[PDB]
Amino acid sequence: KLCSLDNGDCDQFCHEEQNSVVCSCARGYTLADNGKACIPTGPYPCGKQTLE
Amino acid sequence: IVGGQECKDGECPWQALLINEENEGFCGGTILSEFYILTAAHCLYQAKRFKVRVGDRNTEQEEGGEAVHEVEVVIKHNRFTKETYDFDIAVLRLKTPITFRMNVAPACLPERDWAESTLMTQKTGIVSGFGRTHEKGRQSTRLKMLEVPYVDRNSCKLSSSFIITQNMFCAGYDTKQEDACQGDSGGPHVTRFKDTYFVTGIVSWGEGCARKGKYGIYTKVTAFLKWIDRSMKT
Ligand SMILES: CS(=O)(=O)c1ccccc1-c1ccc(N2CCc3c(C(F)(F)F)nn(-c4cccc(-c5n[nH]c(=O)[nH]5)c4)c3C2=O)cc1
Ligand code: NA
Ligand code: NA
């Protein structure tokens, strides 16, 4: 299943390499230590509503 | 936007408004970064000289966080033609960078395969704009948004009098009388994925607005990611 199973548990981009899930993030985000979550590098990261 | 809801504070921060010499909004745009706006190529024929308004939600009131940006470079797709409305995409490079703040933030550009398998396969996307609130009407003074179901590609082709190319996609309702309209052109169609909004479309055209058995036609952003990436380096 990999990327077809809940986006491979990635926050954002899910890729398949050697029958394994590889997560990546858009610009302005850094991939977290767990290699799944995407952390904003600074204020106003892309795609976030400014509700606060 | 016909129907839908007003964009509340901080809800549609990627929305840009193209304004003519008379300071009236005529098309939308999407903030991609501090120097770049994504819009429709056909919007560039709607005004001789135009500027970009960001952080604007109400065109009657000055919003403080609201700013006017001049266009330095217009990057228009050479393949666009009024006969087909194919390749309805343009990138604008601004003279000064946008200050991101409440109501001003870029939408994410997804990667092609993931957008197609993951974003495009979600039930819905969100279209927003200052366009007409009824097929026959004036431009809205309020920024509106509307959740629009992704429309099956076959149903899309059958619904239309015109050729739906591979650079286009349908979204909207068959019966429910809510859709994007004139003046929303160039604006965002974004898809939410785990609380992150990715730009998936550019309001392109439609046969009327909110007509039964008809849909909003969007430029498919995935078909132009390399061209967009390239435009941002130049
Ligand atoms: C050039 S062509 O050879 O015809 C051709 C050749 C080949 C392909 C397309 C075309 C083509 C057909 C119709 C149009 N037109 C027709 C008139 C109109 C009006 C109106 F009615 F307000 F005037 N609004 N509007 C508009 C604008 C933006 C969104 C929506 C929308 N989104 N969702 C939804 O339901 N509507 C509606 C249009 C529009 O796109 C423009 C071009
Ligand atoms: Na305003
Ligand atoms: Na419809």
Domain CATH number, residue A25: 2.10.25.10
Q: What are phi and psi of A31, to 5 degrees?
A: -65, 135
Taking the centre of ligand 1 as the mean of its atom positions, its distance from the CA of residue B225, in whole angstroms, is 24
B105/A24 CB distance under 8 A: no
Residue B79 neighbours by CB under 8 Å, 6+ apart: B86, B87
Distance of CA B3 to the CA centre of its chain: 17
DSSP state of B99: P
Structural domains of chain B in order of their starting residue, each with its CATH number: 1-12+107-222 (2.40.10.10), 13-106+223-234 (2.40.10.10)
Min Cα separation A46/chain B (Å): 5
Chain B residues within an 8 Å CB radius of A7: 118, 193-194
**Residue of chain B minimizing CA distance to A51:** B10
B106 alpha carbon, distance to own chain's centre: 13
In degrees, rounded to 5, the angle at the alpha carbon of residue B192 between the alpha carbons of residues B8 and A14 is 155
B17 neighbors B138 (Cβ within 8 angstroms): no
Rounded Cα distance between B107 and B39, Å, is 13
Ligand 1 close to Cβ of residue B84 (< 6 A): yes
- B133, B163, B205: residue to mutate for ligand 1 pocket, most atoms within 8 A of CB: B205
List CB contacts of B64: < 8 A, sequence separation 6 or more: none
- Please say whether the beta carbons of B50 and B58 come within 8 A: no
Experimental technique behind these coordinates = X-ray
- Contact (CB<8Å) B106/A46: yes
What is the pairing mode between strands A29-31 and B15-19? unpaired
Neighbour count for residue B94 (Cβ, 10 Å) = 21
Distance between CA atoms of residues B144 and B25, nearest Å: 14
CB-side neighbour CA atoms (13 Å) of B118? 27
Contact between B196 and B204 under an 8 Å Cβ cutoff? The reply is: no
Contact B104 A50 (CB under 8 A): yes
Identify whether B152 is a catalytic site residue: no
Q: How many domains does chain A have?
A: 1
Determine contact: A48 vs chain B, CB below 8 A. Answer: yes
Range of the domain at A36: 1-52
B227 lines ligand 1 (CB under 6 A): no
Helix/strand/coil for B230: helix
Both tokens assigned to A8: 């491979």
Best of B87, B132, B167, B182 to mutate for ligand 1, by most ligand atoms within 8 A of CB?
B182
Tokens read off for B71: 């266009």
Q: Is B53 exposed, middle or buried (0-12, 13-18, 19+ CB in 10 A)?
A: buried
A15's enclosing H/E stretch is strand A13-17
Q: Number of residue pairs across A and B with CB atoms under 8 Å?
A: 71
Using a CB–CB cutoff of 8 Å, tell me whether B49 touches chain A.
no
Cα B215 to Cα A3: distance, rounded to the nearest angstrom? 31
A7 touches chain B (CB under 8 A): yes
Name chain B contacts of A39, Cβ cutoff 8 Å: none
- Catalytic residue flag (residue B88): yes
Give first-to-last CA distance, chain A, whole Å: 37
Which atom of ligand 1 is least distant from the CA of B208?
A: 21
